[model samples]
Target: EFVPPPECPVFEPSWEEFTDPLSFIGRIRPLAEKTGICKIRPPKDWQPPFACEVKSFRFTPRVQRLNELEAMTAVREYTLQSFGEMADNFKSDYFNMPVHMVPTELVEKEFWRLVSSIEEDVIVEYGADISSKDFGSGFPVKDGRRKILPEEEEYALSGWNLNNMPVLEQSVKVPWLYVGMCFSSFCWHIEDHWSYSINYLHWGEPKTWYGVPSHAAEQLEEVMRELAPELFESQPDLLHQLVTIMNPNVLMEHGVPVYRTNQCAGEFVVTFPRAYHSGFNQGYNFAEAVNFCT
Candidate 1:
């Protein structure tokens, strides 16, 4: 038998104070104005059903010469080039290189420069460990190691010194690093038992998504436990996806949206925490991208 997606706490919206976008009205005015009632998703007055919207965006290629620079670009803005300034350098066991840029957007051109630079650093410094990730099919939970579950295909760059963020506590120092991803596609898995996240995009073109809310997390945990029985035990992320598909709440809350536009090139996305998001190339040829959290 087919399953039903989960449902969230139901709430009603008053329509008296609401108004649909004029563009939308132009398209559906015949039915709304004449017919008197509109059967659109949230009735226009409801709180946004989805946690976020991709709206409209675009990307054109801004290819780079891989050999021209490497580690130097990644953190350039943060270290140097802040504004009317120069790039700086840092030394850490995680890396051994002269840093040139840091990711910043106080301005436009520099923002792309910073982003591109950071991507290079991610590839230069910990990329070896990232690419060499032996998650076996890029699925880390299959082996039962949680928390550090590898977002294998999701190449990310981060620089959050866990000491400063203090997102975690005592004994084990959960140092945080800014994170960015490339060709990243991941399942729904909470991060470190804390408010977690994974933001992504295809640097070359549009991307798509499907997500679930945390309110249904427990029920999803239970349903997944039953879906595969043996296999489910090791794959929490997979189980989450399974349960999410059957969850009314998740299905209702998440509206698969496409992100694309006429951007000349060098366009990207910035995602927030607690937002369950994932995607694949929208027929894009490349998957060079970046993501980080503090």
Candidate 2:
């Protein structure tokens, strides 16, 4: 039985507010921070141009099974353009419509259904890795010697950029990259630092999510362990090592509050400290996430 979680907060910030992202987010701390994760919608026409050349963009894709609980497997590699083509075609064939034409609700429903239908074993390959030459940063970088356009450089130093730090001496760091297709899932996990994360969907089909607030983390674990008792033998201390579904339905039934959302393209999803979140892509999508502080 799949029960939907309560909706998470989605914040739509104005030009001035969004321009000063950190300040704006802190302002919403009392409300959003307590909710676990928050979605930030930028002003209209905020589309940043695609920075990397897709002609030869290469990425290594990792395989994952979509169980109510999940599993990982072998890896493969692909080019952005080719992967996009394959993803689009696979989606169109699946729903018998243009990829974009599939209703959002249908995608969400099918995802949950297929994921729990264990016999089906819906496995998908995704590129969620460190920034590299083929799949470089969407913004300009100092290491990449090639001169970039003025606007591109500006984007690299924008208020939201992690590299826009004061100390000019040394360098930067998980604005992690994500290349996703239909059914590709990021299993339930928390950030390494566990402070905060600002995830940006550069473009593509909307992503869906489930998150539990920080305070409920321990309670959430107790509920999850009760569901996957086998895992408790080892007691799955680290989240990534433990593969079990903390379904929203299961969480709520146990009296642990959970929240969910569909983050559309051109939007930001900020996850607060210790918030446990997991979700999947509806169709072809590209996203980047970086840890941000208050």
Among these predicted structures, which one has the highest lDDT? 2
All candidates' lDDT scores? 0.27, 0.75
lDDT of 2 by residue, 119-200 (tens): 6766677887757444566655556676677767656657765444221223485357888898888766777657688877
Instruction: State the lDDT at 87 in candidate 1.
Output: 11
| Candidate 1 Cα errors over 4 Å, as ranges | 1-185, 198-202, 234-276, 285-294
Best prediction by TM-score: 2
| Candidate 1 vs. true structure, TM-score | 0.29
How well does each candidate superpose onto the true structure, as a TM-score? 0.29, 0.87
Cα miss at 30, model 1 (Å)?
Answer: 33
- TM-score of candidate 2 relative to the true fold: 0.87
In candidate 1, what residue range of length 10 has the lowest lDDT sum?
79-88
Please write out the lDDT profile of model 1 over residues 97-160, one tens digit for every residue: 3221211111122222432354543222111112212211121112244333244212211111
- Stretches of candidate 2 off by over 4 Å are 68-76, 132-134, 142-144, 162-174, 229-236, 239-242
